[PDB]
Symmetry: D2
Subunit: 247 residues, 4 copies
């Protein structure tokens, strides 16, 4: 497929319901050689199973909250893939407390800190650590949400974290482009499995999107077919965002 010959590190696979699983499958379907990371020991077995299914042996633990963990993981990785072609960053977190009720009341300095650190900085931290291992024509990709652009009830601080992320994309595309590295994001709509009857009613295509839809777009965005696209945030929400007062 259009990714054959590409070596992509995939991040954030927690379940087969997870957006990253969908991204992995599509990428694998298109011919990519994949690597996986997992946050904690509890996840390892699971990740290992999926990886095999997808023809992979490369399963490394990585906690993006710690710079060491990051450096370690990419040292191990270089033993198998001394050069590779990018990675998919599908990681986000904010303390659940932050995610309910009045934003002004909910928000805290630490909650603010963590959300931003995990949800946005980790992206550039990862890029910082593997910069010399990336091949010309590599592509990095993260996942975002409408919440970065508009105020959405309860999304609260995550919204701010996502806005920081989408700016990280532009600053990374600008810095890394001259070395043949592309950086994009996908702003995904809400996914039925992983309000919605509102979303479906109002989304132009009249359905919510699927991990498959998201996965297909991600594959395209990490392949050479999208070589003229960098620093972009692509909406994969079935047009949900460009419609208004859809009675």
């Amino acid at each position: 497929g259009f990714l054959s010959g590409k070596r992509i590190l995939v991040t954030g696979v927690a379940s087969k319901l997870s957006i990253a699983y969908g991204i992995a499958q599509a990428m694998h379907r298109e011919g990519a050689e994949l690597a996986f990371t997992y946050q904690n020991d509890k996840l390892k077995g699971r990740v290992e199973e999926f990886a095999a299914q997808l023809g992979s042996d490369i399963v490394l633990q990585c906690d993006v909250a710690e710079d060491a963990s990051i450096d370690t993981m990419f040292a191990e990785l270089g033993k198998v893939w001394p050069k590779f072609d990018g990675f998919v960053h599908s990681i986000g977190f904010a303390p659940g407390d932050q995610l309910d009720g009045d934003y002004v009341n909910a928000v805290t300095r630490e909650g603010f800190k963590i959300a931003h650190d995990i949800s946005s900085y980790s992206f550039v931290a990862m890029a910082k650590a593997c910069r010399s291992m990336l091949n010309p024509g590599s592509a990095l990709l993260t996942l975002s949400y409408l919440g970065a652009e508009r105020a959405i009830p309860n999304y609260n601080v995550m919204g701010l974290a996502k806005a920081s992320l989408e700016a990280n994309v532009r600053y990374m595309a600008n810095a890394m482009g001259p070395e043949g590295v592309r950086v994009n994001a996908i702003s995904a709509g809400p996914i039925r499995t992983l309000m919605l009857a509102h979303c479906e009613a109002v989304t132009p295509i009249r359905r919510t999107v699927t991990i498959e839809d998201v996965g297909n777009s991600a594959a395209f965005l990490c392949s050479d077919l999208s070589a003229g696209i960098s620093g972009e945030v692509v909406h994969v929400d079935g047009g949900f965002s460009i419609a208004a007062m859809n009675e």
Copy 2:
């Protein structure tokens, strides 16, 4: 390929350098079956040639300035492709006088009318005419330019026509989505074959995008791989638009 089994009508092929030729070429490469239109008596020959180069015998005349020409064209195509699934709109024009010098001094009522008529209305005109022939999961695509979003010297009235066009994409996407049709646009950067060294020094990827770059993105957007995307204006300009003050 990812377009196997799709019938796509391509408009505005007028030369081999043309953006539309790059689009036709990539689609063909991905398995699509093509049909072509040509504006006037003059081009028939060349177009007949290119078509044949891309395995097509469907070459029909179409002058978007006229309602009957479009209706007639679709009547003809329907003899051959009673159902199809989508069309690429790569048409635009402003009288040359409109395009040089101070925007306010250059613009005229007639130059304005025409620019908007051919460059923007024509897109919905075609949709309107083949609406019943479109298969569920069809995709419509048009071509745009940064001038729609920023004031660009000399782009003048064309900047206004492209803005209108971008809105058209949104309005069309919202109207046709419920029936299974997607509508998007590509905002392409300057193309070399088709200042350039400033543009390159300032584009993150450091080069101008090519008609291949554009054709590849177009193919994706017209394929089911992009089922989750509608009403979107995708920038294929190497990240030029998201940078500022680069030097």
Copy 3:
């Protein structure tokens, strides 16, 4: 007030409910000297009457569909005001059949042409005709609607016309900037006096904006207080546009 010593032309006053009446009032309150246009002879006496309340006796007829009517209006106006400080463009029109139902079905070539011509071209047509009469420090202002940025049911082809208009604002701002003229737009939210319950429910400030809200904004934009703002589309919709899924 902050408009004292400024001479401003106001178009589109048809009633006391009209946004332009609202704007005229507020500007007059801040000390501007006003002049008015009216479209047809039927409107004449009502306008003369309002103008009188606002200390003006300059009431000229003007149909923006006619170049000649514009030129004639400014000729006449030049007799009293050989030099002035800007105008307020508050005119938009689309054949009513255009504004009901599925956009693709309702839109026609003539409807599209008219909507664009009256609603967008008229803005630059007026600028072009009075360019030499503007003082350094002048300001031009037009009115837009969220429909230019998102697909709104029934707004249909007016959406494309507002989009062409917002781009017209950027191209004019760029062309006229160097001679001391600023150009901007206000994107006004729905006005109760000009669904609304859903609107109020979802607007952050929890009420619809008023023509007073709009007028005060227009007044600021036309004053030297906004000297650092040109080419902008300012949203006066109480934050309606920056929120999502508030329902």
Copy 4:
């Protein structure tokens, strides 16, 4: 003036060159009652002087890095102003090492933490603290920059923090709107005093904005004249942002 009757707290006056100085001055001029804050001991002197200069005896210390200092500052302010009408947030910081060269090589986890903490969280942190003291009709305002929207060389991590800020503005506006509070930002262009040759040449108004221009917009935005504007980022850069390829 149009601010007569209001009590506004002003942060970040560090000099007479400060954008914060230009705002206070303008606000003072429009008849507002001012209070001031200062970061540390060294400033007190300067600050106490400007305040005097603007008829204020209210000078309180505040280090936004600490929730403690903020709570206290407002405790103290409630002694003189038990209720007040909003504040202007003119605070930004990132370590200097962060702001030089390749963003990817420059950024650090700590440097990113600080920048977001001081430049973005501080804003909602103050709102949270004085929420109870705000009169209906209050207005909060913050200062931004183009770096939040586009990738600007050397602006680096500040661009991500400004992006977070602009989203904060939307979430704060959506949350506080229902109790009568409006929240907005100004995105100011580069200011000469406090390349510029480049900028001027390419800024539609052909000059860089001044602290007075910014101050005038801020005053309007904090007054009741702008009661219809909330959740908005107004660009006060002479239109710099909306032009492109300006030859």
